[PDB]
Amino acid sequence: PGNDPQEAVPSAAGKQVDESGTKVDEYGAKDYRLQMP
Amino acid sequence: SRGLNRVHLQCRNLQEFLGGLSPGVLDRLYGHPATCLAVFRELPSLAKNWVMRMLFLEQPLPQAAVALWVKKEFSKAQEESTGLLSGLRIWHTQLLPGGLQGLILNPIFRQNLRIALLGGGKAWSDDTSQLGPDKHARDVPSLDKYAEERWEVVLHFMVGSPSAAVSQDLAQLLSQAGLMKSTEPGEPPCITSAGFQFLLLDTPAQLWYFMLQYLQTAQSRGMDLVEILSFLFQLSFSTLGKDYSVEGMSDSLLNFLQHLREFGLVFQRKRKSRRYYPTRLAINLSSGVSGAGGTVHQPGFIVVETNYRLYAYTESELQIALIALFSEMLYRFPNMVVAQVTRESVQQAIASGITAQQIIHFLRTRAHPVMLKQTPVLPPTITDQIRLWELERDRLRFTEGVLYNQFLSQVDFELLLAHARELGVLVFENSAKRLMVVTPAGHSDVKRFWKRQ
């Protein structure tokens, strides 16, 4: 006890990692990455 | 192959399905629209040249003219066309009409053969479906979207209906051909092992087998009505009928029309009447045995460095639900990085089937990326790792059976081994310990042979 600094930001475990819940601005720029090539 | 070998070649599936039909139905099949299909689907020149020989000749010819037509250096290819002669089931060998073993073709098929090549008449230009004089006057790109929607609904049934709620009976139809498997703990059906390869080549040859699936019942369905209706979309576009099919139809013709429209080969107007127009996918059915298309730049490109096989990402709405149906991969934060920790996700799908040739086909032939830009072989050393995962499911076996122990002589146990082998109930034998495994299906028959010997 008596040791609580900072850091502690990564969080990814399990088979269902489903890392798609917070993107804010990402779906709008997905279409722009297709018509350019 | 688990049920797709007969789909790649069209001339082989038609000859196999014709052998198991009714004699009254085959008589009506020998028509003028069917003459241009039994020859165009072929490939060898020997099997196609014999059709013109039975047209000019009016009398049956003996086998002496056939053994001489090969001169001296051609009888080797004659044996290859011997098995095909019995596939179409149209010739007939008589006794001796003018020599010895006279070969003659069915005169019912010979009459309709000249109508679609030389002679003619009137009933050919009166019936619909096979003709239907009508031109096209509708926006073509607007109707191309409906052809893709008919095939997209089938993809929802293979996964488990993620967002579809249609009333089309397509789950049980594909289950008869070994494509869809019913879920035991649940109720939405999934997919079999041979169903993964169908979602890879994307060829219209599979839709031809779906049309003849309802005819396999052989109850109150005829082939003469299906063959004359399937010839509509085989003539590419500009082949309609306006409203001629409405006047000349029945209850049986409407049933096969609704099933063909849901497959993706023909589009029908509202209220299931008025004017019908075939889709664009029907052109590739009469062109070749396969086909490609659907992209102009191919943004996808895999990696040939490590071993987890980074699959392609960012394409369209087709590859989104396609990779998850294979083995359910993973995705990270950016534009859906699929297949990055492939180690346990692949083994989850291989436990329900030996799907080993479909993953390699999807890894090698996905959009032709590496074989065009690079040069060496696409798979590195994963060809051995994939085979190791398939062998992991062979470590055990879940089967039932009975074992016979405690015999007396050694020569007496050898006679009992032939009893279960002939009936087909033997699995494994052991002559060193006198042990034999017998399935419970034939347990009531093996015990009778032991009490008599």
Q: Which residue has the tokens 């995962």?
A: B389
User: For residues B310 and B302, what is the distance between their CA atoms, to the nearest angstrom?
Assistant: 6
Q: Tokens 């509708």 appear where?
A: B138
Compute CA distances B186 → B177, B181, B189, B354, whole Å: 21, 11, 8, 22
B230, B14 contact by CB (below 8 A):
no
Q: How far is CA B371 from CA A28, B99, B124, B145, B385, in A?
A: 33, 59, 50, 31, 22
Contact residues on chain B for A37, CB-CB shorter than 8 A: 297, 299
**Whether B345 contacts B308, CB under 8 Å:** no
For residue A17, give Cα distances in angstroms to A2, B48, B140: 32, 59, 44
Residues B333, A19: C-beta atoms closer than 8 Å: yes
Q: Where are the beta strands (DSSP E) in B100-142?
A: 102-105
- CB-based burial label for B126 (10 Å; 0-12, 13-18, 19+): exposed
**CB atoms near residue B44 (< 10 Å):** 12
Nearest-CB residue to A34 (from B299, B331, B344) = B299
Angle ∠(B220,B223,B227) on CA atoms, nearest 5: 145
A19 to chain B, any CB pair closer than 8 A? The answer is yes
User: Is residue B230 within a helix (H) or strand (E), and if so which, with residue range?
Assistant: helix B223-230
List the single residue in B314, B331, B345 with the smallest CB-CB distance to A34: B314
With CB atoms and an 8 Å threshold, state whether A17 touches B331: yes
Nearest CA in chain B to A27: B335
Q: Tokens 């987890």 correspond to what residue?
A: B308
Separation CA B136–CA B335 (nearest Å): 42
Alpha carbon distance B431, B272 (integer Å): 68
Residues B308, B301: contact at Cβ < 8 Å? Answer: no
Pair of tokens at residue B87 = 């596939």
Q: Does A20 touch chain B (CB under 8 A)?
A: yes
Closest to B177 (Cα-Cα) out of B200, B205, B146: B205
* SS3 of chain B: helix, strand, coil, percent, to 5: 45, 5, 50
Interface contact A30-B345, CB threshold 8 A: no
**Structure tokens of B140?**
């073509």
Burial of B224 per CB tally in 10 Å (0-12, 13-18, 19+)? middle
Contact at CB, B314 and A19, closer than 8 angstroms: no
Resolution (A): 7.2
Query: Between chains, do B332 and A19 touch, taking CB under 8 Å as contact?
Result: yes
Contact B196, B326 (CB under 8 A): yes
B155 CB burial (10 A radius; 0-12, 13-18, 19+): middle
d(CA A10, nearest CA chain B) in Å? 13
Pick from B6, B2, B74, B7: which is nearest to B44 by CA?
A: B74
| Cα nearest neighbour of B336 on chain A | A20
Task: Find, among B117, B91, B156, the residue nearest to B36 by Cα.
Answer: B117
Where is B420: in which H helix or E strand? helix B411-423
Which chain B residues are within 8 Å of A20, Cβ to Cβ? 331, 333, 336
Cβ <8 Å between A15 and B333? no
Instruction: Name the token pair of B185.
Output: 């703990």
Shortest Cα distance, chain B CAs vs residue A4, angstroms? 28
Q: Provide the experimental method for this PDB entry.
A: cryo-EM
